[model samples]
Target chain A: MKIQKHKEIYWGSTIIFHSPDQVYFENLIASGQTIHEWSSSWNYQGDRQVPSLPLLKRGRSYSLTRDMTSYPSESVFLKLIFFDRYNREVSNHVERSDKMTFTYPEEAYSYKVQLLSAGVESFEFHCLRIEEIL
Target chain B: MYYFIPSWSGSGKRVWHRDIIPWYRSMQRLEFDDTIHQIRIFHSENLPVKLLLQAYMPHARYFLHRQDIFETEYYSVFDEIQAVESNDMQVLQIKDLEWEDDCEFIYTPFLIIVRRQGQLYAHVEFGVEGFISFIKFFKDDQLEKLNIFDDRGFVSSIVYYEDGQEVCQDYLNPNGDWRIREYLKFSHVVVNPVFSRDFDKLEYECMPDLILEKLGYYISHNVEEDSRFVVAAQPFTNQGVLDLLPQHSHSILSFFHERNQASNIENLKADLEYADLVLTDRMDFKETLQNYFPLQAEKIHYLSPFDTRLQLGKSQQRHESKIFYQIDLSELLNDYAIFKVLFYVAQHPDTELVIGVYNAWQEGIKQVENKVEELISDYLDLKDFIKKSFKNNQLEYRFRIRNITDELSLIQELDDTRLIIDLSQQPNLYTQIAGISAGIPQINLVASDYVTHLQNGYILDSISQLAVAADYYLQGLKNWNQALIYSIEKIKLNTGHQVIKRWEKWLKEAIDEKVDK
Candidate 1:
């Protein structure tokens, strides 16, 4: 009998922001639409310092591989956010994303997302990344 | 403002991790070693002097008023200074022994309370008026804020100063009626910001109820004082609960004072009956207190000063005797008796005087070679040797006390390095002997391991809790007569050597033994 096993996983980097005052994250989420609309202007890094290992420079595509042999049921996460750019316009450009896709677990049962790309840079993109084998 | 919870932290380790207590059940232990043996003596040397200066005499402007021992003699400052000094020495000794475990007596950290005002001037002058100023400000500015908590909030502040440099800039809030402030200063404000991390749950709120309760209690307790009204607190998680209770300082003072006319017991009971206060069932102290006036059982809820030692026996003694002590040396003997004894020993005329022993027993090899008789013979032998060595009349030896317990066998096997030398220092004091916690004694009930169950306990992160388990077992064996006597001897001998002989004649009573003259 030939059995098909569906699996998913991911790994990426994301930024974290801390505040005793609550206004910092609230303001970032409100102005994210402009950043996503104008992602072209915001994507320039000039090869300064790529956050990811083996640098995934701005606007670059890289292939990711996961072994289905050892870690058949392991889950992973890939996150990215831009920061250190402080302007009224660029302040909320933190969470603008397009080149990234989320992987789901087992392609069977699903869970609801609590946090998303609602805020700018200081946001959490939570998606299931576990795999199953038959 | 964040006060570390000693009961949960220090006492908890001592009690739950006790050897007698099973490992599975110990997971639920609170802080601070709750065992009776967790007798902590808080003193200045245990704390940073910088914190002390800031808390007591921040600007050094306030001079601690001294009371003369009697008309002819001024107070003994030396004894007080030594009281602080010797505690440091004793604790240093214990720290070296017993693996230097930290108890509530050892680890109570410094506490400071600050309030941000709308105006800087008001905030800066918070503690300016000493006792009285703190009282007046507490009742007027802080009462309503206290009511919100327990409806529930923190109310742990209390005990305000009565009258000294009194300044209440604001009068009581008025629509038609008028009232004066209950206590003075922000003394009622007990905000322990150091321990509390739940800012979301605990917003900024002032506690006045705690202040009133404390002030009333203080007033009732110290009737001989020039004035009675002072703020004090019970305890709360956020700690402002005691401060926010709805009660007048005057009411508390009058309640306790009139009740004291009957006794502290009658008054405390009356308050309990009238106020409908919560009482713990497990505490026999309440019953003990009711029968004896002014002798309240050790309340599960009360905070002592930095160096107050945990003790036992009569509750009346807590009041009649000193519960807390301030460092002073002038009126030394009666106040800090232990220091007095040590000083006398240091100053004794004949440096080569042979030290005598009282009833000190040793436990030689357990059961197998029951050689207790040998221990007794050894002590007598030592005494005879000392007396015989002194052929000259000037070097004659006299009996101090005798080792009533079985002797030679006692010290046979478990005589650690410091046993004889440390024991010889007093040779009769119970407090001193019990207080020293190092050099694993063979028969101490408080910290001995009764049963060893380590072969099958669950694995722990990093390393096994071997030391913690040892303490648990030792606590189990604390009730043994040998252990009790050992601990009491430390207290009795230390008290005699330090307080009675040395400091008393000069600093305490100033008695002139003119019969010699």
Candidate 2:
């Protein structure tokens, strides 16, 4: 079941398929404002290749932040790949800083965010976001 | 043009198998000559790119027009590209973990860990072909935002977490921009949805209508160009599709999907109510439907969904000791004959029974187990009869219970099976179909489509006559082989060519006849 809101330009719905390793917690819980509590050893499972987030509007400027709890923060690396409408990679960003501000390339159609993991000690996914800056 | 309207089919929303398989089977024989024969109808909900790939259809089997997503042109099914997923081990290794000084790693198939100084540090999850699915950093808490990849190699999506809870998820189109964003509340319910660049849009009525809106557009546009007729397998699921359809359709034509009660008669009535023709999978049921919908007898037709491709011969040598019993406990609640068959298996020499229960609930298994105990008490005379067969000494019963889950699983079990028995109140259609395909001899309550009168297996007069029918097939190879050939010969008529021909011949005539009238 999905909500459809487009007819003029066009929109793709939530995908029918997700990557084998990317786990989804679709539910919000009693713990309000806690996006999720997951451990690297307990929650995260996969080979180690970072999965990129859904395509972001390329020309859009966005504010990104990790309202995170616990551990050495630099162990998590934030990477961004910019691609044009034709799907050719145009620009890329690799950062260790959590409080983020990134503007997409002019020719790029989407910006994909990939949070890479360098070290594993205490990993919790809590209130991480990248929303279009008003 | 003839079109089979499937409610929906894709990774997002899956329609019933019966609604789609008939169209799928006919695709091979239909021959997409770009002519006015059969076209499969897919709505906006289905992604054009993955249509052929998902169903694994031959490139140009039929006419299919899926609604364009992101203002993109519909992908030509003929120009299909097969993505060969890389099995290369390059997806697994990462320089970050390998180069870490004094970092001990514990590696498994799915989960791997970095253990430094014998303390738990961090772990990464692996997905298809050992690709790093997602990773974590052990600073003490949890990771919030994770970028997830699409099943189709490269594209990605993001799930946003707020205070250890999911707030929203976003999807990007292949064209390189945001496509759909879902704002989810507790329990993953989408409250407000934002479609990229559709600044004028706002509606929360139920998204499937957006799906149907696109469908109605394409269907009506095509109807203006050509003479169109639609065949829908069921009524209720596609009722919305039915209401939108331009007066062309059918009722439930499932070979073995659902029930036989009074309310189900409504679907048949629905066919008569709006349809110029009615169709069913069995010929026996066609007459039964014609009898019920008496005035519209000509509307009813027997069009089978299964394409009976007969097996050349049995691949596995028949194990005479092995017997496959298929029973439906839901309808056959009495199960008296089943317990009697168990008693017969106990009394018989050198016989092993494999009872396959189809469409039974979890409670059905426990019910059947308790019923086996019920057999012990209710039939004391049978208990005494089983006493000679060494009941308490050699275990309670010799037979084993196997839960038959799906069509392929049922087909897989038939290789070693010598005899098939279906003594349920209503025999399983696909079970009988699979038995015929595997060249296994079968027994039933009476003669039906798959089982003939001793020609395939037997038409038992009573449960008393079960052993006689059993030995007739199991005692030696001759009768078994004889029944096997007859079963194959019977199913030969149901080839894809024949079934598709039935579609062309009858439907064409019905439409023509209606035209003349």
Candidate 3:
């Protein structure tokens, strides 16, 4: 099964991570299915979220990815992180293209993503997803 | 948090240890927690000054951040900064104010702050375009809220017009309202203790008490006057400043290192009248200065700042065995001097001459290397002599240019360089000290105010006299030992510790006579 979502990122802003069970991810998709209309008034409680995917367990492989089709026109970066439940990262990688993916870390339950814009204002993001690949 | 501007050369480090750190230590003793938790060095991509500084100041958190290069000077230039503690959005915006090339600039990365008494202030560089704006920002309604301290102890009250005219006001003429007109015409304000773009000048003029007060370290400069002896080592013009000393005061005017020629001579001429003693490193300079000021002929003292303890120890151990000669060829070398040295080396079959070159790019050094090869090719006997003299095919040649912590480290690394032969017209004081401290007898080719043969060290009359002096010292003759002892005693007494004692002794005598009267 595959699940997809999207969110907006500002020039020097950080996006928070939400659990796959949380309605925030679904509401984001239903509101626009893209990050262009993401509102600043959106509120959240609990631990500050990270732009990343959920961890994998034993006997299962995962592919966590993001689409940058609506990203800033200038050269920007998307840094992905895979980590355990403790938030200790396992692997960190960067992608310049519109699409990025993470694999391995079969036991990781948490992940993070970051945006680094060289000199851009802000941009929209689309099609953030996770897939159980076994 | 402590922030330091990156310095590449040993010159900066030398100054820090000699001048800045001593005062900082004094400040600490006065009961201020000037202790720093972290040190941030702002440099561009290729520089590793942060790592270098970390090696020296290892206890602090060392962070290196790549700063944007300015279009002005080739070396990196820093902007005036106001340090802030929080990474909050509002704080970040105030810290990252827009800075243009020609206008007052601010660099957020250079702003280093640490919470003190639950308050924060930016560490603004002493003299820069951004200084005026930074100070002006706080002088008005916001003055009561923030505390801004100048990094280099520069403070001023005078404001100047664009045409370089000073604005003055009479206190009684406050009702005239001319003050308002003059203030509006002001272009730039000059800071006192004076603003200088040069590092040495800033350090020379720094008032430590003012700096402490600005940092909220409420310290007074009211330390009781102890026995006082003053030595003017830097460029100073007011000779009368020393004349106010007690009857038996011992004030000295020193010409130790490189000096500004114009001001040095001008001040020195006037200083001859007030100075109790004039000290110089070069004998030649002493002679010249006495001739120019014959009235103060008896007041001049020649003090070579070489600590001969190491050389004394090494010479004692040798026991008249191996003659290892170390020649420092850092300065420009002429062919005649080179030939003299080569011939001297050939004289003693048991002797090995070790040549110490500074940087490879030293102007005339490469030529000397080539000339040596050419001479060896031309002379069969010379080549044979060299082969027999030195073993392992490793010519006894070493370069002394390396990262160093102190002057002792410069020549301490060498294992067997016994004697340092200085043929250069100009020699560095630290180089001379390092050689002497290493227990190596130094034979200076040129006679200067500093080196005297059979006194502290040998001074060659000519390049031809090199072998004679080397032979004199190598044989460990009776006079050589006596001279060595005298030289060691001189070194011990000439130190700063002894200098202050000398002043106190002279002062006590003066005070005792006054009481008797």
Candidate 4:
């Protein structure tokens, strides 16, 4: 019952996307589709670092572990976001490798996923690494 | 038994850990015979010093007794001796042979010195008051008993055999100046080297042999490789040193809580030049110290020791349902400021703002009561706004003058509070550290720009910023929990280690330069 309730709330929540990297929205090419449709060829060449869409949710447990099917060889980073009673991102942690999973404690107001790279010429949004161990 | 009696202040505890403790530890490191059993003696309870002693030297015994002179009107040093000598106190015994002759004017001298070979060597006294009076009698035969003087008896006088096997006495004066002329009377005996003795001017010279040798040995080989710090602070300003120093090693800092020219940074020029780091609580005060001596900017570090009682994970009650803002109404509540905050609170739904009114004392109950009423009347216009916005009586706001009976209860209550709005006109370091440690974010509205320097809380630049900050916090806009974590970690890391490391490097360079000379 608890797992079904958790799925209901998570399914209703949205994972919005935003990018200053000109290729993020421009020249979008939809890949082979199924239940989920993704795009590749987003070339983030400019020095400006863009924030990946944040997963805005609270109270329920969350995990953001995804597979990088194709991307730059440079190390990518993942971080945990914790907000106080005020809506400001106070702390962040970067992921060292393929899988970085964490559970938000009760004090955490909201959590989000942030992406960083040295300078990726091309990056693709792949599927969940292990269905994002929630 | 070596008894260390330091000044009753946070800075005094720092000196004990920084210099005295290291001196003893270095003595141990150098394989000096562990003949000295260290005992800490204090008139009042110094929890920090006691805690440090317990943590570091669990074996060392501690002696605590009431101040003989001040406890009661008829209390005299004679009563103390009777208590200790008669075994009524159930402590150490004072033998009859230990009693020294007293002048007729004061029938019973406070101190009875233990003389060896017709020379006053050690004291077997009833309490600190007796120890002090004995010094007066020795210094002057006709010393006025009624005249109030701080006899300034050595902080701790140690009778030990010198390396030459010569009987010698060493003195430790934590805050007192070196009376070289007076000390020269007993030129052959060794004494701890005094630092910056005279108030009008400052001077320092190394002490005679064993005192200097052990300290120099402690500094060079035995002392922990940390820095020495100098803290020139006013009295009763901030209490955060207990949480600052347990992890530190070999860092020495001088705390000058004196009356003459202590508040002035200019007087501290000599000490600052000698010290590896300078710590100050106030923001503008540090700026003034920097402005006068711009070259020493890098050396001056600001660190505050918060109360250790305000630790994490105590409050288990529900906290997220409503927003709690604890406003400091001492000076922050003028008519307009109160109105603006209340009117802003009326905008938010499911928010409860607790305005705290505090005064030094309730000397004038009628005037204080009238002031609270006047503040409420000023907010009358916002009442309609507050009433109209609320569907039920869910959202509430009220002015409460906090009757803080005890400090522990205050911190506990503050733990549940979300945001503390400090509208104090002057710098209040106590409240700031307390608020931050309780995991409650502070929106300090004050002229002292240093409040903002903490970075653990918000600093409101103007009256309008309070509304913006309060609204943002009410809506769960910032992560203050992370701020608390960052602050405590930063404060813990700054436990005089960096300063000690810098000092060690600088002192080595200075010594090498002198050696070449």
DockQ values of all predictions: 0.01, 0.02, 0.02, 0.01
Residue B417 lDDT in candidate 2: 72
Please tell me which predicted candidate would have the highest TM-score against the true structure. Answer: 2
- Ordered from best to worst lDDT, the candidate numbers read 2, 3, 4, 1
The window of 10 residues in a row where model 1 chain B has the poorest summed lDDT is B147-156
Cand. 2 TM to true fold: 0.50
In candidate 3, what are the lDDT values of residues A1-134, reduced to their tens digit? 00011222222213433422221111112221222221111012111121122223333454545454332364455666565422346677767665554465543434455554443434444444555564
Candidate 4 CAPRI classification by DockQ: incorrect
User: Each candidate: RMSD to true structure?
Assistant: 28.1, 17.5, 20.8, 26.5
Give the residue spans of candidate 2 off by over 4 A.
A1-134, B7-178, B181-204, B220-230, B235-239, B242-276, B283-285, B291-295, B307-316, B319-321, B327-352, B357-403, B446-448, B476-479, B515-517
Off by over 4 Å in 4: A1-134, B1-251, B254-262, B273-277, B282-300, B313-333, B363-399, B447-455, B495-517
For model 3, residues B1-517, the per-residue Cα lDDT tens digits are 1112222212342221112121111110111000100011112112221211201110011011001111111111111001111111110112223222234333333232322333332222211111211122221222222112212111111122233333431111111111111122322212223223222222212222222222221111211233223343434453323443445334545554444223445457766667655666566677878888876676676555543213334444442233333334444556676666666666655555545454334344456567766665565244445444344445532211222222223434333454567677655445555555444566786554445667656887776778777777666466556665665666565544555444346445544644653
Please write out the lDDT profile of model 4 over residues A1-134, one tens digit for every residue. Answer: 00010111111112233321111211123231112221110112121121122222223344556455325454344455565423335566666465665654434433445445433434444333212345
Pick by lDDT: which candidate is best?
Answer: 2
Chain B alone vs. reference chain B, TM-score for every model: 0.20, 0.58, 0.47, 0.46
**B409-493, model 4: which lDDT tens digit per residue?**
3554566566666655543444555565565566766633223433556667787777766654445534555555665665454
Q: What are the candidates' interface root-mean-square deviations?
A: 34.1, 17.3, 22.7, 36.7
Alpha-carbon runs more than 4 Å astray in model 3 = A1-134, B1-222, B225-231, B236-304, B307-332, B358-365, B380-410, B413-415, B426-439, B455-458, B476-480, B496-499, B509-517
**Candidate 2 B-chain TM-score:** 0.58
